Each structure stands twice: as structure tokens, then as C-alpha cells.
């Protein structure tokens, strides 16, 4: 029913990894990590690789600590407009 | 110049269905969203869902899943909302509103409202 | 309702006279600020009895064309305020705050004004 996460998410040792099949997909969805209030985390030290179309989000600065691991909140949507309610929100858990 | 003309009020028994039409004029029909809003008598406003007549993309409030169905006819520049299995909670005034995608989808233009009354 | 952005509007009702200035507060459970356009997604609506709602403020600070300057939208990502200076008889209505940053779009419970 609801949209499925457009990329591939992988919990790594020290970071969250989001992979896409092309740069077109990654720039189309433009994933960002947000806090409990839904604002993008500007102290997040993520890395972007457009050779392999991968986004890496370190747990410490980009995710929220909970019992057993981290919760990551991801927002995707169109970057060509200021219409924000068509964006999609996703929440994942990565065990420590 | 922008006008939204909804169909007239309707009175039905519980369990029946109604289809509310909203005809848009004064702007490019497929370039904006159409929002539907429910106002119960003596109560506030509740957001049902939006439809984009361009590609017929839709988004619903999960509370209204299965209750409301949005469709759009580009030739007539008219958006339809179908309400089914009507109960007493479904008696309300229903507004269509244009989400202006230039300004973030904010709803500047509203229809006059359609009163749906469910009684047995 | 999980994941929905909740709009908490206060007070529920207001009773005032003529010429004084009232303030309506609306707080959101989620930030409505977009770093892209550096704006907060919040609208203020006025609805008189027997009429469709009317958009007063959008972007939480910007008045619609033809709206008197006595309506002042203000506030920050979580906290928003609508101030109506020198209230007039035609300002008698119910006022709603709305967030359009997220789907589902949500309203405040509303503020009844009676003079």
C-alpha cells in the first residue's frame, strides 16, 4: 500500500549504508536523515559516493541511540519543488 | 478567476455510497493537487486525501483508507470523491481545495462544500 | 495516527470586545521548516459560519493578497502564533492552523472567537 523504500539499506559496523542503482535514482529521491523532530541533522558526517551510488551515514552523528542499537529516520522526495508533503518518511533500526 | 464547483447536497441511508464531484476552472487542471477536506457539524476540519490529476497519483489519510476514493476527469477538469458504507460519522460537509504546487501545495482556492447527510 | 504531525492549537475559544489584540498559539509535534526554501510550512485559515474556509497566512508569515495587515503570523518551527490586532466584527469566526509540510496534512483543533 504505502511506498516501499526506494533504495537498498544495509546496517554496517559503524554506519548505515543506502545503495541505489544509478545517480539518477539517488538524486531523484535525495535521502536525508532527520531527528525526532523531522529536521535534517546538520551535524551528520555522512559520505556520498556517486561512483557506486552509495550514501553512508555514521551511527554516532546521523542516527539516534536506543536500546540494542540505533534508529535512523530517512526522508526522501523531489528536490525540484518546494512541495514537501509528497515526501516519504522511513524509519529503520540497526543493532549495535 | 479560479473557481471550484462541487455537486449539490445529498441525503442517504447508512450503508449507501455517494460520489462528490468538484469541477475546477481558472487554472491548469493537471498542474496542481486537489485536496478533499471533511468538516463534521460543530467540529473542525479533517484532511482526507489529495489527487494529482496529471499522473493520477493519490495520497490518503490512513483513517479514510477504503472510505474515500479520489478520481479525476481531465476532459471535464473535474475531480470525484466516492464515499461508501456511509455511517453517522460520515455525515459532514466536504470541501475540495486546490493545492497550489507553486507555493508548496498550500490550499488557496476552496469549493463551496457539499453537505452529505446520512439518516435512516 | 502513528507518524502523524499533531497540531496543538490554543485556546479553544476566545471572548473579547472591540479594538483589543488577541493571540492564537499553535504548536506542532514536528518541525515544519524546509532548508531548501528556508520557510516553515504553516497556514492560518478563517471560516465564517456557512462559508468555506479562507486562507489568511501561508509560509506562517506571508499574508494572502487582500488580507488586512492587522493579521500577523509569526513563530518558529515548533511554535507558531497568530495575532489579530484591533479585532473587528467581521473577524468573528473560527480560526485553524494547518501544517502542509507532511502527509497527512493536519489542522489545529480550532479557536472559536465570540464577541
Author numbering:
A (entry chain A): 41 to 136
B (entry chain H): 20 to 139
C (entry chain L): 18 to 132
Paper text:
Monoclonal antibody IE-3 prevents mouse fertilization by binding ZP2, a major component of the oocyte-specific zona pellucida (ZP). We show that an IE-3-derived single-chain variable fragment (scFV) is sufficient for blocking fertilization in vitro and determine the structural basis of IE-3/ZP2 recognition.
To structurally investigate antibody–protein recognition, we coexpressed the unfused variable heavy and light chains of IE-3 (VH, VL) together with His-tagged mZP2-N1. The three complementarity-determining regions of VH (CDR-H1/H2/H3), together with CDRs L1 and L3 of VL, generate a hydrophobic pocket where the fg loop of mZP2-N1 inserts. This dominates the interaction with IE-3, which includes only a few other contacts between the cd loop of mZP2-N1 and CDR-L1. Notably, the long fg loop of ZP2 is largely disordered in the structures of both unbound mZP2-N1 (13) and hZP2 NTR and becomes fixed upon interaction with the antibody. In agreement with this study, the structure of the complex and binding assays of point mutants show that hydrogen bonding of mZP2-N1 Y125 to CDR-H1 D52 and H54 is crucial for epitope recognition. Notably, the structure reveals that F-β-strand R115 and fg loop D122, two residues located outside the VxYK motif, also contribute to mZP2-N1 recognition by contacting CDR-L3 N119 and CDR-L1 R53, respectively. Most importantly, the mZP2-N1/IE-3 interaction indirectly depends on D127, which does not contact the antibody but orients R115 as well as influences the overall conformation of the fg loop by stabilizing a set of interactions centered around R124. Second, the high-resolution structural information on mZP2-N1/VHVL, reveals that the 3D conformation of the epitope contributes significantly to its high-affinity recognition by the antibody.
